[PDB]
Enzyme design. Structure first.
Site, PDB file in Angstrom:
ATOM      1  N   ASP A  51      17.762  35.203  -6.542  1.00  6.93           N
ATOM      2  CA  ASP A  51      17.447  36.283  -5.598  1.00  6.93           C
ATOM      3  C   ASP A  51      17.579  37.665  -6.281  1.00  6.93           C
ATOM      4  O   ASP A  51      18.418  37.836  -7.184  1.00  6.93           O
ATOM      5  CB  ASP A  51      18.410  36.282  -4.373  1.00  6.93           C
ATOM      6  CG  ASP A  51      18.434  35.084  -3.433  1.00  6.93           C
ATOM      7  OD1 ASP A  51      17.399  34.376  -3.353  1.00  6.93           O
ATOM      8  OD2 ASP A  51      19.480  34.930  -2.650  1.00  6.93           O
TER       9      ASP A  51
HETATM   10 CL   LIG Z   1      22.431  32.444  -1.951  1.00  6.87          CL
END
Ligand SMILES: [Cl-]
Ligand SMILES: [Cl-]
Length: 245
Positions: A51
Site C-alpha cells: 500500500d
Molecule cells: Cl494492511
C-alpha cells in the site's frame, strides 16, 4: 523522517534476478517507486504490492523467468511475510490470533474499502488470519500505543489495518481505518512497515529482514516503556518457520 524523493531508494537485497527495496512510506508503486527505480537503475516486474501508506519489503523481478518463479510462490501461497506496527492502546494479551473474515464495504467503500464480517453492508467476506505478537508498550506523542509484530497467513486487501482496527487497536496514523477520536492526521506517517519477506523460488530464496523504523533513535515521539517480547528472537523464529504448504 524525511519525505519520499525520486533520488533516495533503499535497497535491502540485490541479486542477478531479484531486487528488494525498502519502500518509503507514502510512495505509490504504479513520485512513484517505478521513477525511483528508473532513477537508480537507468524493465521492472513487481512480484507483489505494498500500500501507498505502508513502508517496507517489496520484491522486483529483473527478468521474465524470475517473475514467473515469484508469481508461482504467491499464487501457490508459499510466501512468508511479517510486519511491524505501532497500534493505538496497550494490548494486554501477549499474542492474539485475529480470524474475523474481511469483506468489501458496500456502504461507504470509497472512504473505507474493507470491513469485518457482520459490520453494516459487509459483502463477500473472505478467509482471514493475522497473528499479532505484542513487542512493547509505550507512548507515541504521549498517547498509549503498542509496538507489534504482525504475521498475516492470508492476503486480504488492507488486512492488517482492518484487523487491528477491528480489535480496537488501529494503526497509528491510519487515515482510513483509524478512529475520528484518534486524530490520525497528527502523526507524520502511518506506522505499518513490511519487515520480513521470504519468497522461496525454484532458483533463489529471496529472504529479507529490513531495518526496524519504529525506534526511539529514529522517531523521538516513540517512547517505549515496557518490553514484552524480543524482536531479535522472534526474527530467529520467523526464519526457522517452514514455508506454508
Ligand atoms: Cl494492511
Ligand atoms: Cl500483493
Amino acid at each position: 523522517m524525511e519525505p519520499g524523493s525520486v533520488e533516495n531508494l533503499s535497497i535491502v537485497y540485490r541479486s542477478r534476478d531479484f531486487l528488494v527495496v525498502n519502500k518509503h512510506w507514502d510512495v505509490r508503486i504504479d513520485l512513484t517507486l517505478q521513477k525511483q527505480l528508473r532513477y537508480r537503475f537507468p524493465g521492472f516486474r513487481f512480484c507483489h504490492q505494498l500500500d501507498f501508506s505502508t513502508s517496507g519489503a517489496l520484491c522486483v523481478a529483473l527478468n521474465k523467468a524470475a517473475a514467473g518463479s515469484a508469481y508461482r510462490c504467491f499464487k501457490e501461497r508459499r510466501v512468508t511475510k511479517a510486519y511491524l506496527a505501532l497500534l493505538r492502546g496497550h494490548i494486554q494479551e501477549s499474542r492474539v490470533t485475529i480470524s474475523h473474515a474481511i469483506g468489501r464495504n458496500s456502504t461507504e467503500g470509497r472512504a473505507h474499502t474493507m470491513c469485518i464480517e457482520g459490520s453494516q453492508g459487509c459483502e463477500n467476506p473472505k478467509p482471514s488470519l493475522t497473528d499479532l505478537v505484542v513487542l512493547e508498550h509505550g507512548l507515541y506523542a504521549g498517547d498509549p500505543v503498542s509496538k507489534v509484530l504482525l504475521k498475516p497467513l492470508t492476503g486480504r486487501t488492507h488486512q492488517l489495518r482492518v484487523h487491528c482496527s477491528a480489535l480496537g487497536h488501529p494503526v497509528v496514523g491510519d487515515l482510513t481505518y483509524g478512529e475520528v477520536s484518534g486524530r490520525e492526521d497528527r502523526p507524520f506517517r502511518m506506522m505499518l512497515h513490511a519487515f520480513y519477506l521470504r519468497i522461496p523460488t525454484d532458483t533463489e530464496c529471496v529472504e529479507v529482514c529490513t531495518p526496524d523504523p519504529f525506534l526511539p533513535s529514529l522517531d523521538a515521539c516513540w517512547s517505549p516503556h515496557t518490553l514484552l517480547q524480543s524482536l531479535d528472537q522472534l526474527v530467529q523464529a520467523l526464519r526457522a518457520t517452514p514455508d506454508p504448504d
